[PDB]
mmCIF file with all atom_site columns, C-alpha atoms in Angstrom:
data_model
loop_
_atom_site.group_PDB
_atom_site.id
_atom_site.type_symbol
_atom_site.label_atom_id
_atom_site.label_alt_id
_atom_site.label_comp_id
_atom_site.label_asym_id
_atom_site.label_entity_id
_atom_site.label_seq_id
_atom_site.pdbx_PDB_ins_code
_atom_site.Cartn_x
_atom_site.Cartn_y
_atom_site.Cartn_z
_atom_site.occupancy
_atom_site.B_iso_or_equiv
_atom_site.pdbx_formal_charge
_atom_site.auth_seq_id
_atom_site.auth_comp_id
_atom_site.auth_asym_id
_atom_site.auth_atom_id
_atom_site.pdbx_PDB_model_num
ATOM 1   C CA . UNK A 1 1   ? 0.073   0.046  0.182   1.00 32.20 ? 1   UNK A CA 1
ATOM 2   C CA . UNK A 1 2   ? 2.939   2.366  -0.496  1.00 32.57 ? 2   UNK A CA 1
ATOM 3   C CA . UNK A 1 3   ? 2.459   6.104  -1.689  1.00 34.10 ? 3   UNK A CA 1
ATOM 4   C CA . UNK A 1 4   ? 1.313   6.376  -5.653  1.00 34.53 ? 4   UNK A CA 1
ATOM 5   C CA . UNK A 1 5   ? 0.926   9.096  -8.046  1.00 34.23 ? 5   UNK A CA 1
ATOM 6   C CA . UNK A 1 6   ? -2.589  11.160 -7.569  1.00 31.69 ? 6   UNK A CA 1
ATOM 7   C CA . UNK A 1 7   ? -4.656  11.899 -10.171 1.00 30.50 ? 7   UNK A CA 1
ATOM 8   C CA . UNK A 1 8   ? -3.833  13.916 -12.900 1.00 34.86 ? 8   UNK A CA 1
ATOM 9   C CA . UNK A 1 9   ? -7.203  16.152 -12.176 1.00 34.81 ? 9   UNK A CA 1
ATOM 10  C CA . UNK A 1 10  ? -6.731  15.993 -8.652  1.00 34.26 ? 10  UNK A CA 1
ATOM 11  C CA . UNK A 1 11  ? -6.765  18.791 -6.660  1.00 33.63 ? 11  UNK A CA 1
ATOM 12  C CA . UNK A 1 12  ? -3.572  17.902 -4.202  1.00 36.52 ? 12  UNK A CA 1
ATOM 13  C CA . UNK A 1 13  ? -4.286  20.120 -1.432  1.00 31.62 ? 13  UNK A CA 1
ATOM 14  C CA . UNK A 1 14  ? -7.911  17.711 -0.869  1.00 31.64 ? 14  UNK A CA 1
ATOM 15  C CA . UNK A 1 15  ? -5.355  14.871 -1.413  1.00 31.77 ? 15  UNK A CA 1
ATOM 16  C CA . UNK A 1 16  ? -4.213  15.923 1.284   1.00 33.75 ? 16  UNK A CA 1
ATOM 17  C CA . UNK A 1 17  ? -6.226  16.494 4.060   1.00 31.10 ? 17  UNK A CA 1
ATOM 18  C CA . UNK A 1 18  ? -8.108  14.230 3.635   1.00 31.03 ? 18  UNK A CA 1
ATOM 19  C CA . UNK A 1 19  ? -5.173  11.748 4.599   1.00 35.21 ? 19  UNK A CA 1
ATOM 20  C CA . UNK A 1 20  ? -4.565  13.500 7.538   1.00 32.99 ? 20  UNK A CA 1
ATOM 21  C CA . UNK A 1 21  ? -8.928  12.748 8.204   1.00 30.45 ? 21  UNK A CA 1
ATOM 22  C CA . UNK A 1 22  ? -8.884  9.394  7.526   1.00 30.31 ? 22  UNK A CA 1
ATOM 23  C CA . UNK A 1 23  ? -5.057  7.824  8.755   1.00 27.65 ? 23  UNK A CA 1
ATOM 24  C CA . UNK A 1 24  ? -3.301  7.933  5.526   1.00 27.75 ? 24  UNK A CA 1
ATOM 25  C CA . UNK A 1 25  ? 0.789   9.227  6.576   1.00 28.73 ? 25  UNK A CA 1
ATOM 26  C CA . UNK A 1 26  ? 2.680   8.032  3.621   1.00 28.59 ? 26  UNK A CA 1
ATOM 27  C CA . UNK A 1 27  ? 0.081   9.980  1.362   1.00 27.28 ? 27  UNK A CA 1
ATOM 28  C CA . UNK A 1 28  ? 0.950   12.797 3.696   1.00 27.94 ? 28  UNK A CA 1
ATOM 29  C CA . UNK A 1 29  ? 5.074   12.368 4.155   1.00 24.56 ? 29  UNK A CA 1
ATOM 30  C CA . UNK A 1 30  ? 4.570   12.344 -0.082  1.00 23.42 ? 30  UNK A CA 1
ATOM 31  C CA . UNK A 1 31  ? 2.542   15.887 0.054   1.00 24.62 ? 31  UNK A CA 1
ATOM 32  C CA . UNK A 1 32  ? 4.872   17.585 2.576   1.00 24.51 ? 32  UNK A CA 1
ATOM 33  C CA . UNK A 1 33  ? 7.877   16.922 0.765   1.00 22.86 ? 33  UNK A CA 1
ATOM 34  C CA . UNK A 1 34  ? 6.472   18.194 -2.232  1.00 25.05 ? 34  UNK A CA 1
ATOM 35  C CA . UNK A 1 35  ? 4.317   20.680 -1.058  1.00 25.34 ? 35  UNK A CA 1
ATOM 36  C CA . UNK A 1 36  ? 6.479   24.520 0.174   1.00 26.10 ? 36  UNK A CA 1
ATOM 37  C CA . UNK A 1 37  ? 4.361   24.990 2.940   1.00 28.07 ? 37  UNK A CA 1
ATOM 38  C CA . UNK A 1 38  ? 3.366   21.928 5.776   1.00 25.49 ? 38  UNK A CA 1
ATOM 39  C CA . UNK A 1 39  ? 0.415   24.630 6.456   1.00 23.43 ? 39  UNK A CA 1
ATOM 40  C CA . UNK A 1 40  ? -0.637  25.357 3.537   1.00 22.81 ? 40  UNK A CA 1
ATOM 41  C CA . UNK A 1 41  ? -5.339  26.166 4.334   1.00 24.60 ? 41  UNK A CA 1
ATOM 42  C CA . UNK A 1 42  ? -7.592  25.432 2.205   1.00 23.77 ? 42  UNK A CA 1
ATOM 43  C CA . UNK A 1 43  ? -10.546 28.314 1.323   1.00 26.19 ? 43  UNK A CA 1
ATOM 44  C CA . UNK A 1 44  ? -11.428 27.464 5.117   1.00 23.05 ? 44  UNK A CA 1
ATOM 45  C CA . UNK A 1 45  ? -8.707  28.453 6.618   1.00 26.69 ? 45  UNK A CA 1
ATOM 46  C CA . UNK A 1 46  ? -8.831  24.428 7.236   1.00 26.10 ? 46  UNK A CA 1
ATOM 47  C CA . UNK A 1 47  ? -4.866  22.899 6.995   1.00 25.67 ? 47  UNK A CA 1
ATOM 48  C CA . UNK A 1 48  ? -3.221  19.238 7.204   1.00 19.63 ? 48  UNK A CA 1
ATOM 49  C CA . UNK A 1 49  ? -2.477  19.288 11.542  1.00 17.52 ? 49  UNK A CA 1
ATOM 50  C CA . UNK A 1 50  ? -6.564  19.900 11.779  1.00 15.35 ? 50  UNK A CA 1
ATOM 51  C CA . UNK A 1 51  ? -7.819  18.030 9.810   1.00 15.38 ? 51  UNK A CA 1
ATOM 52  C CA . UNK A 1 52  ? -5.020  14.796 11.715  1.00 12.57 ? 52  UNK A CA 1
ATOM 53  C CA . UNK A 1 53  ? -6.300  16.457 15.032  1.00 9.39  ? 53  UNK A CA 1
ATOM 54  C CA . UNK A 1 54  ? -9.830  15.494 14.526  1.00 11.78 ? 54  UNK A CA 1
ATOM 55  C CA . UNK A 1 55  ? -8.716  11.730 13.037  1.00 13.48 ? 55  UNK A CA 1
ATOM 56  C CA . UNK A 1 56  ? -7.187  11.180 15.625  1.00 13.47 ? 56  UNK A CA 1
ATOM 57  C CA . UNK A 1 57  ? -4.888  10.393 14.005  1.00 13.26 ? 57  UNK A CA 1
ATOM 58  C CA . UNK A 1 58  ? -1.448  10.830 16.653  1.00 12.51 ? 58  UNK A CA 1
ATOM 59  C CA . UNK A 1 59  ? 1.100   9.308  14.361  1.00 14.06 ? 59  UNK A CA 1
ATOM 60  C CA . UNK A 1 60  ? 0.183   11.985 11.194  1.00 14.26 ? 60  UNK A CA 1
ATOM 61  C CA . UNK A 1 61  ? 0.185   15.702 14.039  1.00 15.68 ? 61  UNK A CA 1
ATOM 62  C CA . UNK A 1 62  ? 3.395   14.591 15.598  1.00 15.55 ? 62  UNK A CA 1
ATOM 63  C CA . UNK A 1 63  ? 4.798   14.327 11.836  1.00 12.92 ? 63  UNK A CA 1
ATOM 64  C CA . UNK A 1 64  ? 3.597   17.909 11.044  1.00 10.19 ? 64  UNK A CA 1
ATOM 65  C CA . UNK A 1 65  ? 4.607   19.065 14.306  1.00 11.84 ? 65  UNK A CA 1
ATOM 66  C CA . UNK A 1 66  ? 8.166   17.539 13.642  1.00 7.31  ? 66  UNK A CA 1
ATOM 67  C CA . UNK A 1 67  ? 7.885   18.717 9.810   1.00 8.93  ? 67  UNK A CA 1
ATOM 68  C CA . UNK A 1 68  ? 6.849   22.510 11.647  1.00 8.60  ? 68  UNK A CA 1
ATOM 69  C CA . UNK A 1 69  ? 3.848   22.563 10.730  1.00 5.04  ? 69  UNK A CA 1
ATOM 70  C CA . UNK A 1 70  ? 2.375   25.879 11.834  1.00 5.96  ? 70  UNK A CA 1
ATOM 71  C CA . UNK A 1 71  ? 0.632   25.087 14.874  1.00 6.74  ? 71  UNK A CA 1
ATOM 72  C CA . UNK A 1 72  ? -1.551  28.378 15.690  1.00 4.64  ? 72  UNK A CA 1
ATOM 73  C CA . UNK A 1 73  ? -3.004  28.456 12.641  1.00 5.22  ? 73  UNK A CA 1
ATOM 74  C CA . UNK A 1 74  ? -7.038  29.709 12.000  1.00 6.14  ? 74  UNK A CA 1
ATOM 75  C CA . UNK A 1 75  ? -9.250  28.490 10.605  1.00 6.52  ? 75  UNK A CA 1
ATOM 76  C CA . UNK A 1 76  ? -11.969 31.164 8.974   1.00 10.20 ? 76  UNK A CA 1
ATOM 77  C CA . UNK A 1 77  ? -13.803 30.540 12.326  1.00 14.00 ? 77  UNK A CA 1
ATOM 78  C CA . UNK A 1 78  ? -10.568 31.038 14.145  1.00 13.46 ? 78  UNK A CA 1
ATOM 79  C CA . UNK A 1 79  ? -10.046 27.623 15.459  1.00 10.44 ? 79  UNK A CA 1
ATOM 80  C CA . UNK A 1 80  ? -6.696  27.260 16.219  1.00 9.63  ? 80  UNK A CA 1
ATOM 81  C CA . UNK A 1 81  ? -5.119  23.464 15.963  1.00 8.90  ? 81  UNK A CA 1
ATOM 82  C CA . UNK A 1 82  ? -6.138  23.678 20.295  1.00 8.38  ? 82  UNK A CA 1
ATOM 83  C CA . UNK A 1 83  ? -9.082  24.671 19.968  1.00 10.92 ? 83  UNK A CA 1
ATOM 84  C CA . UNK A 1 84  ? -10.259 21.677 17.627  1.00 8.20  ? 84  UNK A CA 1
ATOM 85  C CA . UNK A 1 85  ? -7.884  19.397 20.479  1.00 9.43  ? 85  UNK A CA 1
ATOM 86  C CA . UNK A 1 86  ? -9.645  20.580 23.054  1.00 11.91 ? 86  UNK A CA 1
ATOM 87  C CA . UNK A 1 87  ? -13.192 19.911 21.972  1.00 10.64 ? 87  UNK A CA 1
ATOM 88  C CA . UNK A 1 88  ? -12.063 16.252 20.955  1.00 10.37 ? 88  UNK A CA 1
ATOM 89  C CA . UNK A 1 89  ? -10.393 16.161 24.419  1.00 9.89  ? 89  UNK A CA 1
ATOM 90  C CA . UNK A 1 90  ? -7.573  14.932 22.989  1.00 7.85  ? 90  UNK A CA 1
ATOM 91  C CA . UNK A 1 91  ? -5.798  16.184 25.546  1.00 5.41  ? 91  UNK A CA 1
ATOM 92  C CA . UNK A 1 92  ? -2.740  13.341 24.166  1.00 6.06  ? 92  UNK A CA 1
ATOM 93  C CA . UNK A 1 93  ? -2.632  15.530 21.186  1.00 7.85  ? 93  UNK A CA 1
ATOM 94  C CA . UNK A 1 94  ? -3.528  19.665 23.755  1.00 10.92 ? 94  UNK A CA 1
ATOM 95  C CA . UNK A 1 95  ? 0.249   17.920 25.124  1.00 10.01 ? 95  UNK A CA 1
ATOM 96  C CA . UNK A 1 96  ? 2.316   17.805 22.072  1.00 11.24 ? 96  UNK A CA 1
ATOM 97  C CA . UNK A 1 97  ? 0.617   20.997 20.616  1.00 10.27 ? 97  UNK A CA 1
ATOM 98  C CA . UNK A 1 98  ? 1.190   22.856 24.093  1.00 9.93  ? 98  UNK A CA 1
ATOM 99  C CA . UNK A 1 99  ? 4.976   21.141 24.126  1.00 13.95 ? 99  UNK A CA 1
ATOM 100 C CA . UNK A 1 100 ? 5.459   22.755 20.657  1.00 12.89 ? 100 UNK A CA 1
ATOM 101 C CA . UNK A 1 101 ? 4.138   26.617 20.727  1.00 12.72 ? 101 UNK A CA 1
ATOM 102 C CA . UNK A 1 102 ? 0.225   26.326 20.970  1.00 14.32 ? 102 UNK A CA 1
ATOM 103 C CA . UNK A 1 103 ? -1.090  29.690 21.900  1.00 14.64 ? 103 UNK A CA 1
ATOM 104 C CA . UNK A 1 104 ? -3.206  29.062 25.028  1.00 10.99 ? 104 UNK A CA 1
ATOM 105 C CA . UNK A 1 105 ? -5.244  32.008 25.285  1.00 13.10 ? 105 UNK A CA 1
ATOM 106 C CA . UNK A 1 106 ? -5.950  32.221 21.509  1.00 12.01 ? 106 UNK A CA 1
ATOM 107 C CA . UNK A 1 107 ? -9.939  33.204 21.009  1.00 12.56 ? 107 UNK A CA 1
ATOM 108 C CA . UNK A 1 108 ? -11.878 31.743 18.312  1.00 13.52 ? 108 UNK A CA 1
ATOM 109 C CA . UNK A 1 109 ? -13.850 34.774 15.972  1.00 12.95 ? 109 UNK A CA 1
ATOM 110 C CA . UNK A 1 110 ? -16.665 32.799 16.900  1.00 10.79 ? 110 UNK A CA 1
ATOM 111 C CA . UNK A 1 111 ? -18.127 33.366 20.659  1.00 9.29  ? 111 UNK A CA 1
ATOM 112 C CA . UNK A 1 112 ? -14.589 34.342 21.197  1.00 7.66  ? 112 UNK A CA 1
ATOM 113 C CA . UNK A 1 113 ? -13.642 30.736 22.992  1.00 2.85  ? 113 UNK A CA 1
ATOM 114 C CA . UNK A 1 114 ? -10.768 30.117 24.789  1.00 3.63  ? 114 UNK A CA 1
ATOM 115 C CA . UNK A 1 115 ? -9.369  25.737 24.310  1.00 3.74  ? 115 UNK A CA 1
ATOM 116 C CA . UNK A 1 116 ? -10.100 24.920 27.298  1.00 4.03  ? 116 UNK A CA 1
ATOM 117 C CA . UNK A 1 117 ? -13.473 27.218 27.120  1.00 2.00  ? 117 UNK A CA 1
ATOM 118 C CA . UNK A 1 118 ? -13.573 24.253 23.503  1.00 3.85  ? 118 UNK A CA 1
ATOM 119 C CA . UNK A 1 119 ? -13.984 20.968 26.094  1.00 3.78  ? 119 UNK A CA 1
ATOM 120 C CA . UNK A 1 120 ? -17.208 19.567 24.710  1.00 4.35  ? 120 UNK A CA 1
ATOM 121 C CA . UNK A 1 121 ? -18.989 17.863 28.100  1.00 6.31  ? 121 UNK A CA 1
ATOM 122 C CA . UNK A 1 122 ? -20.542 15.872 26.428  1.00 5.07  ? 122 UNK A CA 1
ATOM 123 C CA . UNK A 1 123 ? -17.952 13.641 24.734  1.00 4.98  ? 123 UNK A CA 1
ATOM 124 C CA . UNK A 1 124 ? -15.456 11.332 26.680  1.00 4.87  ? 124 UNK A CA 1
ATOM 125 C CA . UNK A 1 125 ? -12.335 12.545 28.545  1.00 7.80  ? 125 UNK A CA 1
ATOM 126 C CA . UNK A 1 126 ? -13.977 16.041 29.574  1.00 8.70  ? 126 UNK A CA 1
ATOM 127 C CA . UNK A 1 127 ? -12.782 16.264 32.431  1.00 5.97  ? 127 UNK A CA 1
ATOM 128 C CA . UNK A 1 128 ? -9.427  15.449 31.973  1.00 8.10  ? 128 UNK A CA 1
ATOM 129 C CA . UNK A 1 129 ? -8.707  17.918 29.293  1.00 7.18  ? 129 UNK A CA 1
ATOM 130 C CA . UNK A 1 130 ? -10.194 20.536 30.271  1.00 8.99  ? 130 UNK A CA 1
ATOM 131 C CA . UNK A 1 131 ? -7.996  19.508 34.020  1.00 7.75  ? 131 UNK A CA 1
ATOM 132 C CA . UNK A 1 132 ? -5.099  20.048 31.829  1.00 6.34  ? 132 UNK A CA 1
ATOM 133 C CA . UNK A 1 133 ? -5.903  23.302 30.279  1.00 6.80  ? 133 UNK A CA 1
ATOM 134 C CA . UNK A 1 134 ? -7.282  24.564 33.052  1.00 5.48  ? 134 UNK A CA 1
ATOM 135 C CA . UNK A 1 135 ? -3.046  23.638 34.750  1.00 3.44  ? 135 UNK A CA 1
ATOM 136 C CA . UNK A 1 136 ? -2.030  24.355 31.955  1.00 5.62  ? 136 UNK A CA 1
ATOM 137 C CA . UNK A 1 137 ? -3.533  28.306 31.899  1.00 2.35  ? 137 UNK A CA 1
ATOM 138 C CA . UNK A 1 138 ? -2.856  28.472 34.900  1.00 5.72  ? 138 UNK A CA 1
ATOM 139 C CA . UNK A 1 139 ? 1.305   28.058 35.692  1.00 2.30  ? 139 UNK A CA 1
ATOM 140 C CA . UNK A 1 140 ? 1.536   30.382 32.476  1.00 2.65  ? 140 UNK A CA 1
ATOM 141 C CA . UNK A 1 141 ? 3.172   33.371 34.466  1.00 2.91  ? 141 UNK A CA 1
ATOM 142 C CA . UNK A 1 142 ? 4.174   30.909 37.565  1.00 3.84  ? 142 UNK A CA 1
ATOM 143 C CA . UNK A 1 143 ? 5.780   27.299 36.735  1.00 4.56  ? 143 UNK A CA 1
ATOM 144 C CA . UNK A 1 144 ? 9.519   28.125 34.367  1.00 2.00  ? 144 UNK A CA 1
ATOM 145 C CA . UNK A 1 145 ? 10.122  31.187 36.752  1.00 2.00  ? 145 UNK A CA 1
ATOM 146 C CA . UNK A 1 146 ? 7.611   33.009 35.827  1.00 2.83  ? 146 UNK A CA 1
ATOM 147 C CA . UNK A 1 147 ? 8.897   32.783 31.815  1.00 4.15  ? 147 UNK A CA 1
ATOM 148 C CA . UNK A 1 148 ? 6.520   32.724 28.877  1.00 5.30  ? 148 UNK A CA 1
ATOM 149 C CA . UNK A 1 149 ? 7.447   31.808 24.466  1.00 5.79  ? 149 UNK A CA 1
ATOM 150 C CA . UNK A 1 150 ? 6.574   34.898 22.548  1.00 6.64  ? 150 UNK A CA 1
ATOM 151 C CA . UNK A 1 151 ? 4.986   33.267 18.867  1.00 7.52  ? 151 UNK A CA 1
ATOM 152 C CA . UNK A 1 152 ? 5.017   37.008 17.266  1.00 6.45  ? 152 UNK A CA 1
ATOM 153 C CA . UNK A 1 153 ? 6.590   39.199 16.859  1.00 3.42  ? 153 UNK A CA 1
ATOM 154 C CA . UNK A 1 154 ? 4.823   42.326 18.855  1.00 3.62  ? 154 UNK A CA 1
ATOM 155 C CA . UNK A 1 155 ? 5.496   46.124 18.969  1.00 5.35  ? 155 UNK A CA 1
ATOM 156 C CA . UNK A 1 156 ? 4.065   47.955 21.475  1.00 6.43  ? 156 UNK A CA 1
ATOM 157 C CA . UNK A 1 157 ? 1.291   50.205 20.679  1.00 10.49 ? 157 UNK A CA 1
ATOM 158 C CA . UNK A 1 158 ? 2.002   52.254 24.011  1.00 10.16 ? 158 UNK A CA 1
ATOM 159 C CA . UNK A 1 159 ? 5.043   53.091 26.339  1.00 10.89 ? 159 UNK A CA 1
ATOM 160 C CA . UNK A 1 160 ? 3.667   50.998 29.392  1.00 10.46 ? 160 UNK A CA 1
ATOM 161 C CA . UNK A 1 161 ? 3.666   48.027 26.513  1.00 8.35  ? 161 UNK A CA 1
ATOM 162 C CA . UNK A 1 162 ? 6.747   45.591 25.779  1.00 5.94  ? 162 UNK A CA 1
ATOM 163 C CA . UNK A 1 163 ? 8.036   44.586 21.923  1.00 9.62  ? 163 UNK A CA 1
ATOM 164 C CA . UNK A 1 164 ? 9.265   41.893 21.523  1.00 9.24  ? 164 UNK A CA 1
ATOM 165 C CA . UNK A 1 165 ? 9.932   39.437 18.698  1.00 8.11  ? 165 UNK A CA 1
ATOM 166 C CA . UNK A 1 166 ? 8.871   35.419 18.018  1.00 7.51  ? 166 UNK A CA 1
ATOM 167 C CA . UNK A 1 167 ? 10.902  33.184 20.261  1.00 7.94  ? 167 UNK A CA 1
ATOM 168 C CA . UNK A 1 168 ? 11.743  35.374 22.883  1.00 7.56  ? 168 UNK A CA 1
ATOM 169 C CA . UNK A 1 169 ? 11.298  34.479 26.534  1.00 9.09  ? 169 UNK A CA 1
ATOM 170 C CA . UNK A 1 170 ? 8.731   37.021 28.772  1.00 6.75  ? 170 UNK A CA 1
ATOM 171 C CA . UNK A 1 171 ? 9.304   36.927 32.334  1.00 5.26  ? 171 UNK A CA 1
ATOM 172 C CA . UNK A 1 172 ? 5.795   37.281 33.707  1.00 5.32  ? 172 UNK A CA 1
ATOM 173 C CA . UNK A 1 173 ? 5.397   39.825 36.484  1.00 8.76  ? 173 UNK A CA 1
ATOM 174 C CA . UNK A 1 174 ? 1.658   41.144 37.323  1.00 8.81  ? 174 UNK A CA 1
ATOM 175 C CA . UNK A 1 175 ? -0.534  38.028 36.465  1.00 5.17  ? 175 UNK A CA 1
ATOM 176 C CA . UNK A 1 176 ? -4.058  38.566 38.138  1.00 6.57  ? 176 UNK A CA 1
ATOM 177 C CA . UNK A 1 177 ? -3.695  42.288 37.628  1.00 7.10  ? 177 UNK A CA 1
ATOM 178 C CA . UNK A 1 178 ? -7.044  43.325 37.829  1.00 7.08  ? 178 UNK A CA 1
ATOM 179 C CA . UNK A 1 179 ? -7.451  46.978 35.853  1.00 7.39  ? 179 UNK A CA 1
ATOM 180 C CA . UNK A 1 180 ? -6.288  44.560 32.866  1.00 8.29  ? 180 UNK A CA 1
ATOM 181 C CA . UNK A 1 181 ? -7.529  40.705 32.205  1.00 3.54  ? 181 UNK A CA 1
ATOM 182 C CA . UNK A 1 182 ? -6.404  40.474 29.524  1.00 8.06  ? 182 UNK A CA 1
ATOM 183 C CA . UNK A 1 183 ? -2.553  41.660 29.446  1.00 5.27  ? 183 UNK A CA 1
ATOM 184 C CA . UNK A 1 184 ? 0.334   40.427 31.881  1.00 5.64  ? 184 UNK A CA 1
ATOM 185 C CA . UNK A 1 185 ? 2.928   43.019 33.615  1.00 6.50  ? 185 UNK A CA 1
ATOM 186 C CA . UNK A 1 186 ? 6.210   41.183 32.142  1.00 5.94  ? 186 UNK A CA 1
ATOM 187 C CA . UNK A 1 187 ? 9.890   41.559 31.955  1.00 8.94  ? 187 UNK A CA 1
ATOM 188 C CA . UNK A 1 188 ? 12.143  41.739 29.227  1.00 7.47  ? 188 UNK A CA 1
ATOM 189 C CA . UNK A 1 189 ? 15.702  41.860 28.858  1.00 10.04 ? 189 UNK A CA 1
ATOM 190 C CA . UNK A 1 190 ? 15.188  44.759 31.459  1.00 10.89 ? 190 UNK A CA 1
ATOM 191 C CA . UNK A 1 191 ? 12.445  46.744 30.478  1.00 11.60 ? 191 UNK A CA 1
ATOM 192 C CA . UNK A 1 192 ? 8.859   46.415 31.903  1.00 10.85 ? 192 UNK A CA 1
ATOM 193 C CA . UNK A 1 193 ? 5.280   46.799 30.645  1.00 9.64  ? 193 UNK A CA 1
ATOM 194 C CA . UNK A 1 194 ? 2.196   45.505 28.962  1.00 8.03  ? 194 UNK A CA 1
ATOM 195 C CA . UNK A 1 195 ? 1.768   41.690 26.669  1.00 10.32 ? 195 UNK A CA 1
ATOM 196 C CA . UNK A 1 196 ? -1.490  40.650 25.071  1.00 8.82  ? 196 UNK A CA 1
ATOM 197 C CA . UNK A 1 197 ? -1.946  37.299 26.824  1.00 10.77 ? 197 UNK A CA 1
ATOM 198 C CA . UNK A 1 198 ? -2.998  35.228 23.791  1.00 10.34 ? 198 UNK A CA 1
ATOM 199 C CA . UNK A 1 199 ? 0.821   36.323 22.054  1.00 12.77 ? 199 UNK A CA 1
ATOM 200 C CA . UNK A 1 200 ? 2.625   33.684 24.257  1.00 11.18 ? 200 UNK A CA 1
ATOM 201 C CA . UNK A 1 201 ? 3.015   29.685 25.285  1.00 11.45 ? 201 UNK A CA 1
ATOM 202 C CA . UNK A 1 202 ? 4.308   27.606 27.260  1.00 12.04 ? 202 UNK A CA 1
ATOM 203 C CA . UNK A 1 203 ? 6.854   26.149 24.775  1.00 13.05 ? 203 UNK A CA 1
ATOM 204 C CA . UNK A 1 204 ? 8.924   27.979 22.158  1.00 12.04 ? 204 UNK A CA 1
ATOM 205 C CA . UNK A 1 205 ? 7.543   26.913 18.207  1.00 12.19 ? 205 UNK A CA 1
ATOM 206 C CA . UNK A 1 206 ? 9.727   24.284 16.384  1.00 8.53  ? 206 UNK A CA 1
ATOM 207 C CA . UNK A 1 207 ? 11.869  26.466 14.081  1.00 5.18  ? 207 UNK A CA 1
#
């Protein structure tokens, strides 16, 4: 059952997404080498990683992450790979994503929810997944000496805000600051300022 050249008139991205959804690893492997960007989305913002997650294809997910697939790419509705993993209550995938640069506080375009809030209480594994994500959220600015990793470059909009580049480590000084629920007082190279929570991961992206 090796991989083979597709029928000439079929769209390769479509075959990629189906293979990621059903579980055909070699096909995914072939597509990834041929395409320029393993994070290539269709018209709906859906990427191979999104489908691998929903299909519970652990082998394909690891391959894609290791290959550099954008673990934070949002679809047309603002759902990132972490949001999909949570809605399936798949703790193992959530962990793999978190450990490779997932933005814990990213929110969807629809209903503006975080991954934690997308856990499905109607499906099995709900308690375990929600608890993990809740612990992940609480450990930020506390664990690893209070350090979090920027997942994107950010240019301060105000002097009281902090500028930073993708991949840099930021220390969270004030987390539960009441005056700002979506920002944290932080430190980068001796400078102190506010930074948006959704720009950070517990771990850095795979470069």
